[PDB]
RNA sequence: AAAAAAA
């Protein structure tokens with residue numbers, strides 16, 4: 001008997017279930033929960049915590065993008081102090097219907113904090129105190145199944161490897177292939193790294209891409225399409241980044257696929273208080289501090305776990321603002337996979353700008369010979385043009401299934 | 412006895428009935444005297460809900476703006492049938508107090524009012540990539556059909572498509588859009604066709620009104636930017652409402668670049684101006700307007716094909732174009748150099764294109780276009796068109812052209 | 817003022 005489970009079940013099964021026990025769907029669930037409480041049986045609910053300024057908080061739900069919801073569960077301050085709860089903590093426990101003069105479900109006892117024992121949460125090392133590090137463990141994207149879509153993943157490993165705690169960017173003009181390459185990444189993460197906690201944050205992007213993502217990726221998808229205002233974009237992004245930090249505090253390897261980070265940066269610039277100083281492109285002088293901390297949240301932890309963030313960025317949009325945003329995030333991140341519109345217009349995919357792509361400290365994510373082979377490959381591709389580089393590399397890789405066999409051919 | 416029907420009938424046909432009983436005043440007198448008899452009087456229009464809670468049924472004669480013949484709608488009626496701005500309402504009215512009032516509604520969006528309450532709101536409809544295609548080729552062998560045939564090869568269009576006709580001035584965008592309307596009415600009469608002309612030429616609406624088989628809402632450049640916005644808002648809301656009734660709506664906008672400028676001049680100064688003179692918050696609403704087009708899984712769809720300006724010498728139009736390109740999923744570019752050589756359509760094949768075009772084409776058609784894509788790419792834009800025009804001119808239809816390959 | 821524009 002769980003709240004969110006009743007919200008997920010179809011109306012047909014809810015009406016039937018209600019008739020057996022003896023109005024809008026929310027009323028069906030509410031009436032069914034009340035009747036189940038009268039029997040004396042226990043009721044359960046869950047959601048991600050958001051502590052208000054007064055000291056108390058609520059358990060936002062994913063069906064509301066972790067925003068204010070009618071079925072939010074009240075969490076008393078005493079409960080927060082007992083287990084040292086903070087914004088982002090996923091909470092599950094027994095709940096009760098609202099009494100006379102109340103408007104929300106109350107939390108009786110917390111059973112699980114971040115998919116773990118509540119006693120383990122009180123004693124922990126905060127995310128702000130975790131010792132950062134460069135990416136150590138390699139997150140190889142290559143399927144190896146010889147798939148035609150795997151070509152993108154294979155070229156990515158050779159151009160810009162990705163590790164746990166990476167802080168990368170898929171930079172390219174509109175219609176270059178950022179989203180689908182991000183989707184290709186999501187597929188390889190679910191297959192090669194089912195141990196990682198996968199999250200897909202969609203900010204100010206196409207609505208049909210939201211449903212396309214949630215029915216394609218094997219993970220959680222939090223979205224806020226361009227039908228939504230900038231105020232919603234920020235708040236939604238804040239909840240997702242904090243939930244990730246909480247899981248990292250439990251030594252979890254979280255991966256956030258953001259699209260787009262340029263849109264998110266514009267949103268912050270829309271809600272930022274005017275400072276009387278504007279940068280080139282119409283960017284507020286204090287607007288990029290928040291997005292820089294959001295992107296900079298991604299990091300590798302020595303104590304355990306990591307936070308990875310692969311976000312897409314826009315360039316050559318005709319607006320100098322997007323040039324400033326991209327360059328500011330490049331001085332913040334440590335990995336960039338560029339995609340060329342010139343290559344994409346020739347229908348050559350993946351339209352990857354090999355020379356401009358790359359990853360920082362890639363020697364910590366590759367073997368000694370793997371790095372030496374990648375080093376030689378770049379020296380050969382560099383003199384080539386953007387289009388010729390991809391047509392050359394794709395034709396060579398298509399001959400073999402894996403990059404390891406491709407390397408064996410080079411000798 | 413209908414209100415907007417009396418407004419359509421000539422004054423001569425009006426005076427005939429007016430004298431037997433005993434232009435705006437004589438209509439108001441006929442409706443009033445008819446009400447004295449106890450007989451039913453009728454009226455209609457598109458609803459616009461104000462801030463207080465009540466609304467008015469705007470007339471298509473005033474471009475859905477405020478009108479003396481607008482019908483009053485009480486808040487109880489809006490709540491009764493869960494009406495929202497954009498709903499087409501018809502029913503009995505009453506003589507006024509300086510405004511007619513709706514007695515009871517007979518049809519809500521051309522359907523029983525009770526059925527319009529159990530519907531899902533447009534914001535809750537599940538979006539999707541276009542799966543049903545709107546083949547533009549007529550295959551009649553006409554010279555105008557060439558335009559639609561090249562379009563089917565360069566950038567396919569489907570239900571819920573969100574595309575643009577990008578080109579410099581005098582490249583052939585409007586005449587392209589007119590060719591669109593002709594194919595929409597001839598190939599897909601089932602679709603609700605609308606043509607929204609914003610800040611454009613006055614002779615192009617009169618030419619459109621007679622050319623296209625549908626509705627034409629206009630707002631020439633003789634009108635302020637504030638009017639352009641309000642007119643567009645009304646049209647896009649009416650489209651959303653029809654999509655809520657599972658209708659395949661198609662809006663041919665011209666121009667959306669003019670619409671984006673209108674918003675840019677209306678939006679309050681934010682203290683931040685993007686490159687080209689575009690306010691930092693000026694393009695939000697235009698994005699939601701153009702981004703209204705989408706394919707619905709529950710049924711119906713909204714397709715928007717708008718023209719866009721480039722190479723205007725103004726960086727502003729370059730920012731708007733790139734912004735809409737990152738919002739839509741289809742573009743059909745037109746070259747000024749091809750148009751100056753009298754080569755029509757002046758389509759820039761390599762620049763044009765449609766996203767997820769595999770969901771709109773058969774596997775054979777996709778491969779044919781893929782090969783033809785690689786062959787045309789090395790050619791110059793002028794040499795590309797003159798090459799494709801000749802090959803397509805040899806045949807009446809694209810299917811037989813695919814057979815030559 | 818900055819942004820924009822200009823360069």
Ligand SMILES: Nc1ncnc2c1ncn2[C@@H]1O[C@H](COP(=O)(O)OP(=O)(O)O)[C@@H](O)[C@H]1O
Pocket residue numbers: 331359360361362
């Ligand atoms: N002397 C060097 N030898 C090898 N690689 C270097 C050297 N200097 C910089 N790099 C490369 O540059 C990356 C880091 O650049 P960084 O010093 O952060 O530049 P910046 O400080 O200008 O951002 C590393 O991943 C490294 O591979």
Ligand SMILES: Nc1ncnc2c1ncn2[C@@H]1O[C@H](COP(=O)(O)OP(=O)(O)O)[C@@H](O)[C@H]1O
Pocket residue numbers: 558578579580581582583584585586587755756
């Ligand atoms: N398919 C066509 N066939 C012949 N002439 C055309 C065609 N398309 C455009 N034109 C020429 O272009 C002129 C109008 O261009 P227009 O459609 O207004 O371009 P834009 O809308 O980009 O300003 C007409 O005078 C016409 O001669």
Ligand SMILES: Nc1ncnc2c1ncn2[C@@H]1O[C@H](COP(=O)(O)OP(=O)(O)O)[C@@H](O)[C@H]1O
Pocket residue numbers: 152172173174175176177178179180181349350737765766767768
């Ligand atoms: N790996 C790929 N294989 C084939 N087509 C691709 C690939 N990546 C992108 N595309 C093409 O790009 C279009 C979508 O581009 P998108 O990913 O939205 O770029 P962006 O996100 O930069 O706007 C699709 O229609 C698709 O045909």
Ligand code: BEF
Pocket residue numbers: 173174175176178179314736737738
């Ligand atoms: F149009 Be892409 F999503 F930048």
Ligand code: BEF
Pocket residue numbers: 330331332
């Ligand atoms: F990214 Be570098 F540190 F400027």
Ligand code: BEF
Pocket residue numbers: 579580581582584585720
């Ligand atoms: F002059 Be065109 F209508 F852009």
Ligand SMILES: [Mg+2]
Pocket residue numbers: 178179180259
């Ligand atoms: Mg994208």
Ligand SMILES: [Mg+2]
Pocket residue numbers: 584585586
């Ligand atoms: Mg025109």
